[PDB]
Symmetry: C3
Subunit: 421 residues, 3 copies
């Protein structure tokens, strides 16, 4: 049996009082990871090569995820059965070196570690013909699925409350990669086309986006004994809300009281990202991110995001170092023009089973500090039925109430373990 | 650690629209498997031989099942802890080669793959003395348990709504097998006696079946480089409803509104089955089933079922083939004399890690087509309290409403993976 | 992959009728284990040494628990994700042979097998520096966490029903062990200090205990080819209710109707324990316990407990024996002075993969008998709101109703498997 996974777990305290807290800017889709994670998360994989004959082989892989709050010993939970697929390599003579697979599978995800941000991820149930050799590069083809909670109607109503049927969305993906545009660099290009796939007779709301596009282009340059990635992405409509490759063409959301409300995503998104990790000499390592994301919706509720941070590691011993992370966020509401922002600074002393910023297990002892000043928030007060502004960006003092995290401070500290195997 | 299991997973589309659908005749207890399965199901076993001394050994086995809808990546679920038992072989000098075991264990199940139909299965918590050598054959003894949701009353009421206590049922099993009645053939005989085991003072409903019998006789003949099984079974009363060896002597069911209703199973069942797989030459393999099942209940709500289908595999390469399945069902209501029926035809191109119809992993790409015409259905409209005909067979247009699947068509298609290890 | 666990599973019957029952004295915190367990419980561990360099190594461990009722095959359940931690040994040059760890981990538990009683157990999320060599003995340091369901208020109310916020408690532990006070004996000493850690601004009830102490001293003497432990413990206030090392300084409980009620634990506890297992010759083994526990609360609802039992094993063969267990309990209510008591006698014939009372797998076939006479019970009738005596000790006939198990008899029997690996 093969055994792999990821897991993080720990214990912490908040400067002001009680269990530890985590800090994320209202409107941003991420937080600066170090000494700013508040869960025990864990994926346990058990795979195995079940048959081999020369070049031909069949591999079986599975994944079961657990997420608990780590406030107690016995903590019951509903695990997620995230992957169970079979991949057969070299089984098709004519297209050599390629694989065909079917089943639930995490499929070629692209992410940014220090902010735990996945920027191109279409995993889920699916199937595909992977790694076909096109000479100048490798070309892969796949189809995956997602399905939104409700959003379709059995008959034609004018009442959004009748659109409660789960609505399926398909994604068709095509990538061309490992092209050496330059010396040291490579270029990957991909096209994603998604669409809500309606049951015979069902109907979507009026004006629902329905389908959409995501265009990705990623360049990898080898540098300072490490690397640098520069991405640029462009999304359209039903692909703007998730923004990783998955489609939500129905435009209907739901309150905690089962009331349907309208999230319509016609619009577009533009992403410009650059991240990497470089080694400078023998005693330093350092990861870094810089991103600007702009979701512009017709519905006028989009946002414009900016981030930057760096994680420099300095090594006393081959297995003892001092890590430091500094991050800055700033989100501006499309609807109101206000701006929310924050900055965090963490200081940690770790012991890892490695000599790299990328090596783990790791055992940290840290201290984090954050100061934010938010001037807007989302209005989730009331009910999708009571409230008409339900789920819209609204200023910090809108109608004498108060939205957003405010303008304060805080510091937390503790011990943590993190590890991929 | 030992690692074994079963798992199936995939992606599909319905000709008419949306996610894929599966087809099963109303009244039949099975569907023709190929390109007609709509879940990600998976059992993960982790066992181990914990002690051996010569002939003596102690084996530890466990099983944990997962079933999700494969419409998304993160799909939480409550797993079933299905087996955790210990078997010790040769530990009793006097009866050599035999095992004694205790714990939850799948125990000697007999099924029919293409229709995924288990026809003799009494697994659950239990214990037994297995494989005693009686000279002309092997004789095994076991006791397993089941318990129905409610069905007993603390005091004597006349109101069925007072019969809500979980009611336990025990099964006592005896089999005599591996007897060579003829050359190439073998004969197994088994007797099952089950009964509801009431708590001190509790009482069952008036007229409740209470106990019952299942008699099995299975002949296996070696043929065409494969085999053929011919079964004949006979059940009585509290063994007719489940019809695999488990007992339900209480006769009380429950609506989705927690209202008790009366399912009384006094009557009998007669099963005549013949299935097998044969190889004809070097380029063809083919599985086949033929069955006739008649449940006759006093309560007049039984049914009379008929099935036939064949799955012929033709192999282009030692690892690439074209499979085809064709199935026919026809169920007639005891209560109304009407008949429901259907026929399915699937065509698939697979790649397996084998050269057999029985070998897997397998990766299929298929298309299925079905046409049914149902003339009756079960009335589950209303409430066990609102409705008096709750859960009874009723014609297709009974009281202007409509029961059954109707008289239509459909075709689906997709990709799937399936594998036992 | 490393694979370990514990698991017990089986099938049983009650003399009087139905599934088997288990017997525990009202007020006692344990039952005499043999042929007196009614669940399928199982922990499945999968660990692994992920990196080693000479003396230095990093170990990864995990645990997932399942508990089902064994009344059926398919039994769904919510598993508990109990441990996921990383321990790195010898990573700190200056303090050699010591480990530093972080994550959810079972940490140095001390228990009493025949009564399944854990008397010093602070496991949960946490971190620590383990096994520092202090010359005359080994000194370890750790901090673990727990959190009670509710018990804090956002503002200052006088209504206990406003104290519904989960309230966290930290524990700080220090032990000094492996000191050879005498020849053959050793001495461990430990101090535990726990306290509810309130969020900025939240408040506890008036008079809430808040914090507390647990003092442990355990002496182990090597004897009769086995051993003997003699413990003495002393707890104070917020450590008296759990009484194993975990803190509950809030004093607020909840009915099944979400109504807060007051459990206040100011008081103290005194524990005197002596247990062990000895071998006498070659044909006998025998475990034994003797304990006296007195929880004295200001609130006057404490109890005074007494137990004694012995489990003598006599071995026919190196792998076939006859086990016997005899236990006696007697609890007296602090509030009413009444006394509850019981005695059990079990007789079993087992087959184990060992020659010891401590060796398993084991497969038992047994019969148990118990006779009790309880004269008081807890009043859980009504609601924390309806009832004012909710949850208090009350005599057996208080207000014409009836509390406690009464004065009866019973006998059960069956087969079971049990195994740690
Ligand atoms: O295994 C490689 C991978 O390990 C780590 O990624 C894990 C994350 O740490 C963990 O939070 C989780 O990520 C989730 C994202 O937060 C969320 O945006 C969404 O996409 O679901 C994710 C769950 O899959 O899981 C991943 C891995 O399963 C590490 O951060 C990565 O650097 C590394 O690529
Ligand atoms: O492992 C041998 C076994 O593998 C396959 O059987 C699995 C079925 O595919 C799967 O559906 C499931 O069967 C369930 C039945 O549908 C149901 O009638 C009832 O009896 O519960 C069953 C769950 O145990 O599980 C089995 C195996 O666990 C394959 O179909 C068989 O040919 C083969 O014998
Ligand atoms: O693995 C060593 C350990 O095995 C056995 O202990 C298990 C118990 O049999 C099992 O009931 C369970 O114990 C629970 C206690 O009943 C309860 O008081 C509380 O502390 O939670 C416990 C769950 O951890 O689990 C343990 C082991 O996980 C055996 O009894 C012991 O002798 C032995 O030390
Ligand atoms: Mg659940």
């Amino acid at each position: 049996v093969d055994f792999h996974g990821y897991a993080r777990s720990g214990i912490g305290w908040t400067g002001s009082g009680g269990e530890q807290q985590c800090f994320q800017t209202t409107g941003a889709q991420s937080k600066y990871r170090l000494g700013n994670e508040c869960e025990t998360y864990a994926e346990l994989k058990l795979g195995q090569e079940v048959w081999k004959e020369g070049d031909k082989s069949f591999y079986f892989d599975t994944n079961v995820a657990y997420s608990v709050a780590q406030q107690n010993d016995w903590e019951a939970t509903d695990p997620a059965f995230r992957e169970a697929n079979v991949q057969g390599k070299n089984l098709i003579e004519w297209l050599p070196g390629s694989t065909i697979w079917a089943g639930k599978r995490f499929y070629q995800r692209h992410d940014v570690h220090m902010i735990d941000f996945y920027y191109w991820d279409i995993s889920g149930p699916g199937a595909g013909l992977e790694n076909i050799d096109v000479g100048f590069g490798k070309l892969s083809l796949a189809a995956t699925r997602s399905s939104e909670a409700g959003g379709s109607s059995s008959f034609a109503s004018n009442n959004i409350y009748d659109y409660t049927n789960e609505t399926a969305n398909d994604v068709f993906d095509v990538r061309l990669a490992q092209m050496e545009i330059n010396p040291g660099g490579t270029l990957e290009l991909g096209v994603d086309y998604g669409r809500a796939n309606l049951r015979d007779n069902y109907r979507l709301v009026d004006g629902a986006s329905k389908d959409g596009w995501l265009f990705t282009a990623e360049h990898t340059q080898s540098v300072l004994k490490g690397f640098n990635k520069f991405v640029v992405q462009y999304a359209t409509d039903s692909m703007t809300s998730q923004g990783k490759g998955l489609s939500q063409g129905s435009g209907v959301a739901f309150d905690n009281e089962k009331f349907a409300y309208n999230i319509n995503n016609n619009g577009h998104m533009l992403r410009i990202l650059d991240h990497g990790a470089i080694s400078m000499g023998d005693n330093w390592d350092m990861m870094y991110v810089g991103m600007y994301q702009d979701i512009n919706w017709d519905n006028d509720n989009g946002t414009k995001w900016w981030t930057v941070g760096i994680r420099p590691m300095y090594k006393w011993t081959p297995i003892m170092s001092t890590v430091m992370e500094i991050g800055y966020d700033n989100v501006e509401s499309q609807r109101t023009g206000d701006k929310n922002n924050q900055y965090k600074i963490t200081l940690a002393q770790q012991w890892q089973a490695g000599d790299s910023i990328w090596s783990r297990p790791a055992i940290r002892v840290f201290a984090t500090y954050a100061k934010w000043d938010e001037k807007w928030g989302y209005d989730y007060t009331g009910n999708a039925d009571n409230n008409a502004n339900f789920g819209k960006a609204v200023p910090a003092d809108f109608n004498g109430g108060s939205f957003g995290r405010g303008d304060s401070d805080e510091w937390t500290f503790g011990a943590q373990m993190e590890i991929w195997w």
